[PDB]
């Protein structure tokens, strides 16, 4: 028992640890502590690498020791905090970060970690404040800088945007050289002008964090099936998601498990989340051949084992680097074929993923170098939505003519309803506007139209007309919470109007209902150019989040736009959100990162969407959606072409009518919203993947 004996072991181990051999670092640190038990720095370092190994309970014990031994050890409080955060004790993490800060007001990391808790909780201003404090205290601090950058992206603070982008690139480049974990998150990397090489490298380094956490389990390779004989000629497909519940992913693909053909497929849904009580979870549970709640099996070893016992041929990763992911499951390779699908719009960058399911428009061969996976092409778009099932009440609209001697508009006052035809047939006088199968009933301004308008204007919940229930589209939540979320189809007729959202009755409405983080200065310039060329037009955006609004309005004033040219509405429930798209004339897609779910949402309302596909997967989805829809005239080769298409749609009301009618027809007539066709194509593709493997081949691009 000696202090400088133990001191030497600690330095040998920071060495092994620096190299990257985590496993030896531990054995050294542990000998250091047998030699000198009261060695604060050893306890703290052992704890740090136990945390990396995902042995949180044990890490936490050693942090506690470090603190007992050295009570001024701010650093150990800060990392104990992080351990508690990963353990879901955000309460206890918070106490750690705050205690660090009281003991050493000048200690930057605790300020940064306090900011991350705020950021995770949606408190973006509180996060910005604490990241700024960390950077005053320690101006070279990449973690703090890159998280502040994402906070600023979220609220559309573009102060020193180009200089900031230049510095994020600079930090990633330095961190990839110096072999550290990059401070830019792979999901965020799509937003910054990094190289395809850098984005893939960022992904790959996040993938390797899974390898550290599964190497501690010391499991051997699994024996994979070589044939379909034990599964009766059925291919066993395992869908793995944290999002079988009320989450966009489920709003896209909840119908698909149920649409698989039982003669050739056996469907396993592996949920990483507990049952949130919603119908989305009910449906996947009810319709999958097998539903396994892996939230009840927190050990990645035992969960991977469970996948392997079920005999899965193709395991499908629906999370990539999103909240709730357990990529450890995939790193353990319990299945012989492992595919990225739908939920993550980027590469895993990881050796443990074989294919990415995409399409020729989204992921053309010229840009294959950005993916670590082999391309597996679906015939049209990889994108899909459940809109035909969730929102069939929007398959048909009717309007009210209130101008009377004026225009018959398709989007100022709109009725939708499963029982709309019956309500219309009860009315005396209904003009039917043919659409040069399809037609738009027009309620003229009788006293019934006045009663509907009265309801909208007095802000009443609902009225009754000839026994039919007529709902104010702002009150869906009070009438039927389940209809509001998309869990139920509304059983009332819903009225939606521009007057509800403060949209001008006599103007072109350009919408974008994405989260504001997808907007960059260039995009708002493009939009300003369009608005300047189409007088009285407005841009319709969401408080997504609200603190973004003042920032965008400021950048818009500096571009010479009066305040009233951009109209902000609150985020709404799913069904109001999709329905009120019917009020727009055109949707202006964000080129930096496209609307994904949001794209399918505007197209379901028959709202034409203008996009400029970039190079990233995330920047090409809207074009892929539109080529499948069959509207190639809405895809721009550059900013000039985008502005021109938008301006044409706003100035040439005959062209607008034609293109809106195209989208309105083709949402039904094209493959885009056809879940049965989608599922059958996904099945054709699964079988290619499998035949290729059965013939004894390593994975290769599937383009035919």
């Amino acid at each position: 028992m000696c202090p400088t004996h133990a001191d030497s072991l600690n330095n040998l181990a920071n060495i092994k640890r620096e190299q990257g051999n985590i496993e030896e670092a531990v054995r050294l640190y542990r000998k250091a502590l047998e030699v000198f038990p009261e060695f604060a720095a050893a306890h703290s370092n052992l704890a740090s690498v136990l945390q990396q190994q995902g042995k949180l309970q044990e890490a936490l014990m050693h942090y506690k020791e470090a603190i007992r031994i050295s009570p001024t050890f701010a650093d150990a409080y800060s990392n104990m905090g992080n351990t508690l955060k990963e353990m879901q004790d955000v309460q206890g993490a918070l106490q750690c970060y705050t205690r660090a800060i009281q003991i050493n007001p000048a200690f930057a990391d605790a300020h940064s970690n306090l900011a991350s808790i705020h950021k995770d909780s949606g408190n973006i201003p509180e996060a910005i404040a604490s990241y700024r404090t960390a950077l005053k205290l320690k101006p070279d601090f990449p973690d703090a800088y890159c998280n502040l950058a994402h906070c600023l992206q979220i609220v559309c603070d573009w102060t020193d945007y180009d200089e900031r982008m230049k510095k994020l690139v600079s930090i990633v480049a330095d961190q990839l050289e110096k072999n550290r974990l990059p401070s830019v998150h792979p999901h965020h990397s799509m937003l910054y002008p990094l190289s395809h090489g850098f984005r893939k490298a960022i992904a790959e380094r996040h993938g390797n964090l899974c390898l550290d956490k599964i190497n501690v389990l010391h499991k051997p390779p699994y024996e994979h099936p070589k044939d379909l004989k034990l599964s009766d000629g059925r291919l066993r497909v395992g869908y793995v998601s944290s999002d079988f519940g009320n989450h966009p992913t489920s709003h896209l693909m909840q119908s698909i498990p149920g649409m698989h053909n039982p003669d050739k497929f056996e469907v396993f849904c592996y949920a990483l989340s507990p049952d949130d009580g919603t119908n989305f979870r009910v449906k996947v549970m009810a319709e999958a051949n097998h539903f396994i709640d892996l939230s009840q099996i927190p050990c990645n070893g035992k969960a991977a084992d469970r996948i392997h016992q079920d005999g899965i041929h193709i395991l499908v990763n629906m999370n990539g680097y999103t909240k709730g992911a357990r990529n450890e499951l995939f790193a353990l390779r319990p299945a012989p074929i492992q595919a990225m699908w739908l939920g993550y719009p980027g590469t895993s960058g990881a050796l443990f993923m074989d294919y990415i399911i995409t399409d020729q428009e989204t992921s053309p061969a010229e840009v294959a170098e950005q993916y670590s996976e082999k391309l597996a092409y679906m015939p049209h778009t990889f994108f899909i939505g459940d809109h035909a099932n969730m929102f069939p009440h929007l398959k048909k609209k009717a309007v009210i003519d209130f101008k009377s001697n004026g225009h018959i508009y398709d989007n100022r006052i709109v009725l939708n309803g499963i029982d709309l035809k019956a309500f219309l047939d009860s009315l005396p006088d209904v003009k039917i506007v043919k659409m040069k199968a399809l037609n738009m009933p027009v309620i003229p301004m009788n006293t019934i139209a006045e009663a509907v308008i009265e309801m909208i204007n007095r802000g009443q919940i609902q009225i009754t007309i000839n026994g039919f229930s007529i709902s104010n589209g702002l009150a869906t939540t009070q009438i039927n919470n389940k209809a509001a979320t998309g869990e139920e189809v509304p059983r009332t007729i819903i009225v939606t109007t521009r007057s509800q959202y403060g949209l001008p009755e006599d103007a072109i409405v350009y919408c974008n209902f994405n989260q504001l983080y997808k907007i960059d200065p260039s995009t708002l310039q493009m939009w300003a150019n369009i608005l300047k060329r189409v007088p009285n037009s407005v841009l319709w955006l969401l408080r997504f989040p609200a603190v973004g609004e003042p920032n965008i309005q400021q950048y818009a004033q500096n571009m010479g736009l009066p305040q009233n040219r951009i109209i902000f509405s609150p985020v709404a429930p799913k069904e109001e959100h999709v329905r009120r798209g019917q009020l727009a004339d055109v949707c202006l897609d964000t080129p930096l990162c496209n609307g994904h779910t949001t794209g399918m949402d505007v197209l379901w309302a028959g709202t034409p969407m203008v996009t400029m596909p970039g190079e990233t997967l995330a920047s090409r989805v809207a074009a892929s959606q539109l080529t499948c829809l069959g509207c190639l005239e809405l895809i721009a080769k550059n900013r000039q072409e985008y502005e021109d298409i938008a301006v044409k749609l706003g100035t040439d009301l005959e062209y607008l009518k034609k293109v809106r009618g195209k989208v309105w027809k083709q949402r039904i007539s094209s493959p885009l919203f056809n879940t049965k066709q989608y599922t059958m194509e996904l099945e054709r593709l699964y079988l290619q993947m499998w035949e290729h493997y059965a013939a004894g081949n390593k994975p290769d691009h599937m383009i035919k």
């Binding site: 308008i453 909208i456 802000g459 104010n472 702002l474 109007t497 007057s499 509800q500 959202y501 403060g502």
Partner: peptide, 7 residues
């Protein structure tokens, strides 16, 4: 549930 303006 008021509208921003009157039709």
């Amino acid at each position: 549930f008021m509208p921003k303006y009157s039709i």
